[PDB]
Design a protein around this ligand. Structure first.
Ligand SMILES: [Cl-]
Ligand SMILES: [Cl-]
Lengths: 625, 625
C-alpha cells in the first residue's frame, strides 16, 4: 500500500451482470467525455472572444494573452492541490502499476475523480501543449470502480491481480477510445500500454463497451449536430513507388526524435531535483512554478511578437486541420503558415523545435495532463516538412512522365504524426488510430512501414515515456525484454540468482530467529522444515516476525534468557510459495511469471531445497546488462 | 508426443538475428503465396475454358462440368494420402495445440510441406466451397521451422512452450495476412484463434513481418505487371440512424447461424463415424468418399439444371464481387442473380441454404482446406437479402426530408459477411479484415455492432469451429472461461480438486511401490518426503517407475528373488513441481496458469502437504458446469 509524496515535478510513492456493467460503463464514459469536451470548447471560445474584444493596443492584447492561461493554470493547480494531490500528471503508469496487483492509497476515490475532472477541464482550457489520454484512462477507471461499488460485482475473487484486471482493463480501453474517438484503435492502444499479456476475453469486453460508447456518441451528435480530422485525398494512386524511401526516412527520424523526447523529459525532471536551494524555494511557494512556466510559454507564442514565426495564432485543432489539408503550399492554412517575412520551410522548422522543447517542459507541471496530442502535432509538422520538400523537388511528378499525378504533402504529415506518436509511446496501434481519425485508408502501407521503423529504432535507445515516469515516481518496475538480440535466450536462472536467501527453520530458537532477521534488509524470511534438508515451506512477513519477538520479549512475569529455546509457528500466518523456479529455467519464462502471475519474487529449488532467490532487482540487472 | 491415425474425415491423435529471421520469413511467405495464387488462377481459367469451349450438347457440358472437379479432388486426395496423411484438414487446431507445448510427430517437415502445397493447389482449383486460411497458417509455420533449421536459432531456450511461441507466432500471423491480403487484420485474427494470452512483443514481430510481406506483394503487383474486393459506396450519408436495428438483427441472426454451422459440421462428422459397415467399406476404398461428395455437389451447381436458381455459373470471387456492388437489384451483377423464372429474393434464399449445407459437407472431406471464405460468402448473401428487402420497403428513403439518400444494399452485405465469419470463428478481427479488404471505413459502426452481437450470441451457444475440430481429433482441450454469467468467480480450487492423489514415499519399500502402481492409472505419481509429513517434492513418470521395478525384479547375478527391500530413488529421474495451487485459488487464475505456463496438471499443497490435484478433466467439468 504505497503512499503519495508531493514533489515539484510528478511525485513519489513510498512504503447476466457483465453486459449490464459494460453497457453502463460505456454510457457513463460517453456522457462524461461529452460534457468535458463541451466545457473545454466553451473555455476556448471565451478566450478567443476576449482576445478579439479588447484590441486597443499591443499592451492590452499582450496582457490578455498572457493573463488568461496563467489564471487558468494557477486555478487548476490550486484546486488539484487542495482536493487530491495524487491526481496530477498522466494516469497510465499508475494504472499499469495497479493492474499488476500493487495498491495505491486513494487513487480511485470520489475526491480524486472531482479533482481530475475539474483540473483537466481548466488546464486544457488554456493554450498549453497538453493532452488528455492518461487523464481519460484514469477517469474511466474511476467510473468503473464506482460502478462496481454501486452494484457489488467482483467481490468473489481472491487475488488482487485477478479482481482488478477485468473491470480496470475494460475501463482503460473505453477511456482511450473516448479520448481519440476511435474505438478499435483505442482498445488496441490501451492493451499495449497498460499490460504485457492480455487475454482475448478482456479484448472482447473492451470491444463491446467501446462499441456502445461509439453508438452513444453518434446518437448525441445526431441529436445536437472521420469525425475529428477527416482528410480528402485523391483515391487514384495517392502515392507511387520510389516514394517509399521518404516514408522510411520519416520512420527512422521519428524513432530518433521520440527517444530524444523521452530523454529530454527525464533530464528536465532530474535537473530540477539536483538544485537544492531553488527546489526548497519553489516548494515553499508551490503555485509559482506552474505560473512561471505558463508565462514563459505564452509570451513566446504571442502572435504579434515571436508567435507569427511559429503559427501561434492557430489552436491545436486548427494546427492539425491545416497540416492535413489537400493543398500544396509551395505552389486558413497558408496564411498562418506563410508569414510575410518568412517561408513555409522556416516556419515549419521553428514550429517543430519550439513545440518540441515547450511540450517536454510543459508535461511536467502539477496539473492533470497528457502527452499524446503534442507529439502528434510535432510529427504532423515534420511529415509536412518532408512532403513539401519532396513536392518542391519534383514539381511535375516522380513516376516516369508527368502523368498529372503529383505528390500529396498531406499524406506525409499523416504518416509522420503516427510515426512519432508510436515512437514516443512504444505502440504500433497508432496506425489504426490514424486510419480511424482521418477516415481514409489509402496511405496504409507507408503508415505501417514508418510506424514499424520508428518503433524498432526507438526501442533500441530509450524506454517508453510511461516506463520513464514509472522509474521517476519510484514505482515497481519490471523492465521490458528486448527485440533484435538473441543473447537473452542463453541466460538462465542459475546465473542471476542470489544464494544468500535469508531463512528460518522449524526448530528456530529465538536465539536463531533474532540473528537472521537483523542480518537482512528484505521484507520476508523464508521458512524451511529443517536446516539439514532446507525443504521450502513458505515465507514469513517482516511485520509478523518482530511481533513474535515482541510478544515474547514484552514485559511478562535476567529473565530475558528464559524465553529463547522453544518456538511456536502454529499461531503464525505463513503465506505459501506456489510458484518456484528451477536452475535451468530461461530468462523469458521468468519474465512471463513475474509479469502476469502477480508475484514480486520467486524461490529457486532443486527438489525441495532452498538454493537461491530471484527478485525484481536481479531481473533489471540481467535484462539491462 | 502424439501420432496421427487415419479415419474417414478428420483423423485422430493417439498415445540482429531477429531482423534477418523476420525479413526472410516475410519474403518466403510472400513468394509462396504468389506462386500458389498463380497456380489456382491457372486451374480455374482452364476450367472456364473447358466449359466455354464445347457447346455441342448438354450431355457433354454436364460431363465436363462434373469430370473436372472430380479428377482434381481425387488427385489431391491421393497425393496427400501417399506423401503425408497428416496434411489433411485445417491446420489451425494443430498449430494451436503445438503452441501450448504439445509435440506432434511429423507435423512440420518437408514432405508435409510438399503435400500441403500441392493438395491445396489442386483442391482450391476444383471450384468446391473451400478456404485456404488454416492451410496458409500451417504452410507459414513450416516455412519458419525450415528457416530456423537452416539458420541455427532459438536453440538456447529450455522449455518447449517458450521456444515454440517465439518462432511460430509470427509465422501464423504472416500466414493469415498473406491469405487475406490484410496485414493488420491478419495479425489480429491469428492472435485470437491460436492462443489465449498473447504478448505484445510477438504482436510487434508479427506486425513487422506482415509489413514486409505487404511491401513485397505491392512491389510484385505494381512493378511486375490492392483491395481484393474493392467497394465504391457514396461517402455522403452512407447510412441513416434509423437503419441500425437492421444491422443489429443481422448480427443476432448471424450469431445463431454460425452456431448452427458449427453444430452441423460436428453432427456430420459424428453421424458417419457410428455406422460400422458403411465406414469400413469406405475405408477399404478410400478415394470413393471425396469423389462421391464432389460428384454430388458439382451436379447441383450445373447452370442448365438446378444451378441457375442458385447462381452456379459464378465463381467464388465473382460471387463476392456482385454482392458488394453499388447498385440496387430491385431498383453480370444481377444477371446471374435474376433468372428468367425467378427473382432476386428466391435466388438469394436458395443460394444461402444450398451453400450452407454444401460448405459444411465439403469442409468435412480429407483434403487440405479451410472454411473462412464459404461462410464469408454466405454472410454476404444474407446481408444482401436484408439490404434488398430494406430498399424495397423504402423506395424513396428512410427519411422523407430529402429523397437523395436511399438504402445502399452493398453495405448490408459487408456487415453480414463480417458478422457471420466472426460468429463462426469466434473473432472480432473480421471487422478490421473487411475494412482492409473493401478499402473503405464508412460502415465502421454497423460492422462493429453486428460483429459484437454475433460474437456474443454464438459464444453463448456453441464453441468455435477450431475448438470443435480439436475435440473431434481428441487433442488436448482447454475450454474458454465464458462471458456474461459471472458465476465462475465463486468457484475455488477446493471445490474442483480430487483428494486421492497417487503418491509414493521416500522410503518406499518395493511392495508399497507395487501397490501404488497397481492402484493408479495416470501418467505420473507424486513424491512425498514421508507418509507422516506428505511434503511434495516432485513426480515420477510411469515409464521410469516401471523400468525401476522391472530392473529390480529382473534376473540378478522356487522364486526367492522377490527382493522387496526399500527402493533407491537417487538414480531415478524426478521432474520438479514448480507451479502449485492453494485451496482458495480462483477458477480464473487456475485457467491462466494452465493456459500460459504450459502445464497439464497441478498439485494442491497446504504448507507443503499434498492434499489434491487438478487436471484438465476437472477444469473442463468445472468450466462446462
Ligand atoms: Cl491526447
Ligand atoms: Cl479463406
Amino acid at each position: 500500500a504505497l503512499q503519495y509524496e508531493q514533489t515539484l515535478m510528478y511525485g513519489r510513492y513510498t512504503q447476466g451482470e457483465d453486459w449490464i456493467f459494460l453497457v453502463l460503463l460505456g454510457l457513463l464514459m460517453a456522457l462524461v467525455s461529452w460534457v468535458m469536451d463541451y466545457a473545454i470548447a466553451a473555455c476556448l471560445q471565451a478566450q478567443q472572444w476576449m482576445s478579439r474584444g479588447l484590441n486597443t493596443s499591443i499592451l492590452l492584447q499582450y496582457l490578455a494573452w498572457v493573463t488568461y492561461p496563467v489564471v487558468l493554470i494557477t486555478f487548476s493547480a490550486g484546486f488539484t492541490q487542495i482536493l487530491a494531490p495524487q491526481a496530477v500528471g498522466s494516469g497510465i503508469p499508475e494504472m499499469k502499476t495497479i493492474l499488476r496487483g500493487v495498491v495505491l492509497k486513494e487513487y480511485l476515490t470520489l475526491k480524486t475523480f472531482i479533482a481530475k475532472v475539474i483540473g483537466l477541464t481548466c488546464a486544457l482550457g488554456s493554450g498549453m501543449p497538453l493532452g488528455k489520454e492518461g487523464p481519460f484512462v484514469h477517469i474511466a477507471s474511476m467510473c468503473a470502480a464506482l460502478l462496481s461499488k454501486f452494484l457489488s460485482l467482483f467481490g468473489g475473487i481472491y487475488e488482487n491481480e485477478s479482481r482488478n484486471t477485468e473491470m480496470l482493463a475494460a475501463a482503460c480501453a473505453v477511456g482511450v477510445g473516448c479520448c481519440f474517438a476511435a474505438p478499435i484503435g483505442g482498445v488496441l492502444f490501451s492493451i499495449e500500454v497498460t499490460s504485457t499479456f492480455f487475454a482475448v476475453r478482456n479484448y472482447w469486453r473492451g470491444f463491446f463497451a467501446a462499441t456502445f460508447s461509439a453508438f452513444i456518441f453518434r446518437v448525441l451528435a445526431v441529436w445536437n449536430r472521420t469525425a475529428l480530422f477527416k482528410t480528402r485525398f485523391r483515391l487514384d494512386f495517392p502515392f507511387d513507388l520510389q516514394e517509399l524511401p521518404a516514408f522510411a526516412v520519416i520512420g527512422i527520424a521519428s524513432g530518433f526524435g521520440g527517444a530524444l523526447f523521452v530523454y529530454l523529459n527525464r533530464k528536465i525532471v532530474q535537473v530540477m531535483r539536483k538544485q537544492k536551494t531553488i527546489n526548497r524555494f519553489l516548494m515553499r511557494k508551490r503555485l509559482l512554478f506552474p505560473a512561471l512556466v505558463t508565462l514563459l510559454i505564452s509570451t513566446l507564442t504571442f502572435p504579434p511578437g515571436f508567435g507569427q514565426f511559429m503559427a501561434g495564432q492557430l489552436s491545436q485543432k486548427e494546427t492539425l486541420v491545416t497540416l492535413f489539408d489537400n493543398r500544396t503550399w509551395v505552389r486558413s492554412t497558408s496564411q498562418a503558415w506563410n508569414p510575410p517575412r518568412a517561408n513555409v520551410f522556416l516556419t515549419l522548422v521553428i514550429f517543430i523545435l519550439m513545440k518540441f522543447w515547450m511540450s517536454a517542459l510543459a508535461t511536467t507541471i502539477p496539473v492533470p495532463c497528457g502527452a499524446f496530442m503534442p507529439v502528434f502535432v510535432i510529427g504532423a509538422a515534420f511529415g509536412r516538412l518532408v512532403g513539401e520538400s519532396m513536392a518542391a523537388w519534383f514539381p511535375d511528378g516522380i513516376h516516369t512522365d508527368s502523368s498529372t499525378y503529383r505528390i500529396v504533402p498531406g499524406g506525409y504529415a499523416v504518416v509522420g504524426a503516427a510515426a512519432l506518436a508510436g515512437a514516443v509511446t512504444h505502440t504500433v496501434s497508432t496506425a489504426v488510430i490514424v486510419f480511424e481519425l482521418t477516415g481514409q485508408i489509402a496511405h496504409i502501407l507507408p503508415v505501417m512501414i514508418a510506424v514499424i521503423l520508428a518503433n524498432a529504432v526507438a526501442q533500441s535507445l530509450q524506454p517508453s515515456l510511461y516506463d520513464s515516469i514509472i522509474r521517476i515516481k519510484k514505482l515497481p518496475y519490471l523492465p521490458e525484454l528486448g527485440w533484435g538480440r538473441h543473447q537473452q535466450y542463453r541466460v538462465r536462472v542459475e546465473d542471476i540468482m542470489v544464494r544468500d536467501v535469508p531463512h528460518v527453520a522449524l526448530s528456530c530458537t529465538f536465539r536463531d530467529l533474532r540473528l537472521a532477521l537483523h542480518r537482512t534488509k528484505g521484507r520476508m524470511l523464508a521458512l524451511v522444515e529443517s536446516p539439514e534438508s532446507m525443504i521450502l515451506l513458505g515465507s514469513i512477513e517482516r511485520s509478523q516476525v518482530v511481533a513474535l519477538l515482541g510478544a515474547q520479549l514484552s514485559p511478562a512475569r535476567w529473565e530475558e534468557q528464559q524465553l529463547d529455546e522453544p518456538v511456536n509457528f502454529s499461531d503464525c500466518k505463513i503465506d505459501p510459495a506456489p510458484f518456484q523456479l528451477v536452475e535451468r529455467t530461461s530468462l523469458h519464462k521468468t519474465h512471463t511469471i513475474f509479469s502476469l502471475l502477480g508475484v514480486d519474487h520467486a524461490y529457486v529449488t532443486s527438489i525441495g531445497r532452498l538454493i537461491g532467490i530471484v527478485t525484481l532487482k536481479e531481473l533489471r540487472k540481467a535484462i539491462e546488462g
